[PDB]
Write a protein that binds this ligand. Structure first.
Ligand SMILES: *Cc1ccc2oc(=O)c(C(=O)O)cc2c1
Length: 224
């Protein structure tokens, strides 16, 4: 997260991290006791999921292996359209005040809405600074018309853009697959943006969760 600050402790119980070799790979969100929602770009054969602490490296956190995952079949590594994946935990997440399911959206929040994006991704770019504590930043939803001025026909209608005018506030490498929450619901998953990160007036691009409700529920049901 670029130009953010540490999240208030205990305010992101639905936030998870996907680890590989005890290093941060991606962010993610807890959907229910058995499932984690993340970006399809985060695909791996095996995952170690960190849950229940704002601090990566915290002995208090749960560490659950996940051997199965399912990318949306429409996912393209070329254009990043349909960038979402469900990760099946090997054992159930043990719920508490620090581990809770996210609230999935019923509706799509409009342009101009204030949201919060969170993650353990680098706080600097191109030079990397990976934090221990979970970082937060507030951004506003940007209309597809305004976002098209930057990214042209690379943008699809199931992608959601967010940022702050003339501001570096944004997500970066390591935050991928993590949550963008607006008015109490999960509206986006961190997907892509410009590189170096935090470039003013280059919006962050997210998978628009409200467009994928059916697939998310059907996939969990089928692979239960
Ligand atoms: C989209 C995506 C896939 C895998 C990634 O692995 C990583 O380790 C990072 C990072 O900067 O921690 C980002 C990734 C993004």
């Amino acid at each position: 997260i670029i130009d953010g600050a540490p999240c208030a402790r205990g305010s992101h119980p639905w936030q998870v991290a996907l680890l590989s070799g005890n290093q941060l790979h991606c962010g993610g969100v807890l959907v229910n006791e058995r499932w984690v929602l993340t970006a399809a770009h985060c695909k791996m054969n095996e995952y170690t999921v960190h849950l229940g602490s704002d601090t990566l490296g915290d002995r208090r956190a749960q560490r659950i292996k996940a051997s199965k995952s399912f990318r949306h079949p429409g996912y393209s590594t070329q254009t990043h359209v349909n960038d979402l994946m469900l990760v099946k935990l090997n054992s159930q997440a043990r719920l508490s005040s620090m581990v809770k399911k996210v609230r999935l959206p019923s509706r799509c929040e409009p342009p101009g809405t204030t949201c919060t994006v969170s993650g353990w991704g680098t706080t600097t770019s191109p030079d990397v600074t990976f934090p221990s504590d979970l970082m937060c930043v507030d951004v506003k939803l940007i209309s597809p018309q305004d976002c098209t001025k930057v990214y042209k026909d690379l943008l699809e209608n199931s992608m959601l853009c967010a940022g702050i005018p003339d501001s570096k506030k944004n997500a970066c490498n390591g935050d991928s697959g993590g949550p963008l929450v607006c008015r109490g619901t999960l509206q986006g998953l961190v997907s892509w943006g410009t590189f170096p990160c935090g470039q003013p007036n280059d919006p962050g691009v997210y998978t628009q969760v409200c467009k994928f409700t059916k697939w998310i529920n059907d996939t969990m049901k089928k692979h239960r």
